[PDB]
Symmetry: C3
Subunit: 147 residues, 3 copies
């Protein structure tokens, strides 16, 4: 009895996310030398700081992204969840690249990343509603019945 098929896209986007994230980490450790900010200092020129911060922000949002990706993907629709997952990751790639150049050039891909993410949350929320709402409405309609 196999359950890999219903989940392979979610897992593949998850892996994209892992790679994207590793990339950022490596872009940080390359800016590190080039500034020449030394560990454990994480402050330097305003450019290295911009890069460091992009990485931190992504790395903060990454578990929220994974969490909802799996919940939307399991309770709503795998391919739809996988789809926002890609837009999101893509938006976060543009985000990291804008930021590195300019603080202002980070915002369009941030705005794009925020949309994709909030979409994932709604789908997750809707999928949980479906699962939970009927059984509970069914039982609500038992208290008032009684005839």
């Amino acid at each position: 009895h196999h359950h890999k098929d219903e989940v392979a896209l979610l897992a593949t986007v998850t892996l994209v996310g892992v790679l994207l994230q590793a990339y950022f980490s490596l872009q940080v450790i390359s800016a590190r030398r080039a500034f020449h900010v030394s560990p454990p200092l994480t402050s330097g020129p305003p450019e290295f700081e911009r890069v460091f911060r992009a990485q931190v922000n992504c790395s903060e949002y990454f578990p929220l992204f994974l969490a909802t990706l799996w919940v939307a993907g399991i309770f709503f629709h795998e391919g739809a969840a996988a789809l926002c997952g890609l837009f999101y990751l893509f938006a976060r790639l543009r985000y990291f690249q804008g930021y590195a150049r300019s603080a202002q050039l980070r915002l369009t891909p941030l705005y794009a990343s925020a949309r994709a993410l909030w979409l994932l949350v709604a789908m997750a929320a809707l999928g949980l509603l479906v699962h939970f709402l009927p059984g509970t409405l069914r039982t609500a309609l038992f208290r008032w019945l009684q005839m």
Copy 2:
């Protein structure tokens, strides 16, 4: 063959966690303007720093929380795991709100968050013991037998 039912609570608490976390992120980006700490600076008045740090700390503990939530929930008991999950998230909400006002007002909800979390770990540990201990004790009692 469906497996959504045994997992829906875990997923729902997970989603609460995601929302709670997003909230913190937004409370940070609102304090940001109001201090008027500008990106990528994350240092400012001692109040903005308190808020920034609450967010970081939660965001650090959030995957540990998710990890154990799923392990306790799958190997010990879904509703019990879901239950600490809520206390924990709740404690972390009080934590973020105390911290913002006062560093000292963060501690009671931190202490509460630490309890809920350590509970989750024990349950996870106990559920893994159940799963693993018999099969291994069974096989231990094979070496010394032999008659």
Copy 3:
């Protein structure tokens, strides 16, 4: 119908990871008092800073580690994935301990942690290829056929 058996190792390593991570957090909060860096300050002597940073770095990589652990473990091989998982965690334990003493003494276990992690990624990638490649090659060989 039960699915706990194919997953118990992954979950157990995950739990090791959670404990390891908690340990770091506690080692940080012990260095905190001992420096005597006070919250929310995260800057101090160059030794407390080294410890703080080890923790941050691990805590950054921890979801990537979990993500791939589960993907490698489900799509490639549970015991192999669980195995790198241990080397990795071990390497990250040596990493945190080297760092605390010396910035230079952090690197061998970092290099070891990076290997274990990249291994996990390959296995995850290979397991996804297996799953996805045939069905897609099969369908590729449909366009050009046609006779």
